[PDB]
């Protein structure tokens, strides 16, 4: 809507400026505008979209956790009644978080994923789809939670299938996808053994392929491998 009058190139330029200024809400609005121009995104452009929305939703997730904790404390035996304000404000933040997730999922469905033919682009977008369903799952309850969890699992699984066929085990998108799917298993799906098995197998397969990499690629792969190791240490 509001970015309809601005050039695609201008929107990208301004997203980059907003990143430098740590103005992630602006950055996300600029990137939404860029996507809605209807052209496929380059690798750099996909990175900008991801950075913008991850920062926005990251802030919301942190705020939601603070408020949910206060709320849980107030609903314990012996706690004094303070009225509806904590629940009302947690709900406000929650609704805004869900709105951001729905926006991202909307961009992926209209029409980023369907137009993405290359493995690198398709896996990147399906991973994103999994991530934003996972953020919805973090705040969901009941039967709604079940369908949201299934949607995340389905997106991650399609991404995994493609990445295993089409990318080497050290590819950073493949590694980041496996990291995030392992987090899904541990934190969302109540499957810690699946989480551990995935992290371990992913780590070991990457280890075996490191000899093929240049110094820059080596640095990126090993960083993500260390995150797998950090989780394995936390989980065991």
């Amino acid at each position: 809507g509001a970015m309809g009058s601005m050039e695609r190139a201008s929107l990208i330029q301004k997203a980059k400026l907003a990143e430098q200024a740590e103005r992630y809400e602006d950055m996300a609005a600029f990137m939404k505008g860029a996507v809605e121009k209807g052209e496929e995104l380059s690798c750099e452009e996909r990175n900008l979209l991801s950075v913008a929305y991850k920062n926005v939703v990251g802030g919301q997730r942190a705020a939601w956790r603070v408020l949910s904790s206060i709320e849980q404390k107030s609903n314990e035996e012996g706690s004094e009644e303070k009225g509806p304000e904590v629940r009302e404000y947690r709900e406000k933040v929650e609704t805004e978080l869900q709105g951001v997730c729905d926006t991202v999922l909307g961009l992926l469905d209209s029409h980023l994923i369907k137009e993405a033919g290359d493995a690198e682009s398709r896996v990147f977008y399906l991973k994103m789809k999994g991530d934003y369903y996972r953020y919805l799952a973090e705040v969901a309850t009941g039967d709604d939670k079940k369908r949201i969890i299934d949607s995340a699992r389905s997106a991650y699984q399609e991404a995994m299938d493609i990445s295993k066929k089409e990318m080497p085990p050290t590819n950073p998108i493949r590694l980041g996808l496996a990291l995030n799917f392992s987090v899904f298993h541990y934190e969302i799906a109540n499957s810690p053994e699946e989480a551990i098995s995935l992290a371990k197998t992913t780590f070991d397969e990457a280890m075996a392929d490191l000899h093929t990499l240049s110094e820059d690629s080596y640095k990126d792969s090993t960083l993500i491998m260390q995150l797998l190791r950090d989780n394995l240490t936390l989980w065991t």
């Binding site: 950075v51 920062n55 991530d131 995030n180």
Partner: peptide, 9 residues
């Protein structure tokens, strides 16, 4: 402590 996911690009 929550598990670590992929960091920002």
């Amino acid at each position: 402590q929550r598990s670590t996911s992929t960091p920002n690009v």
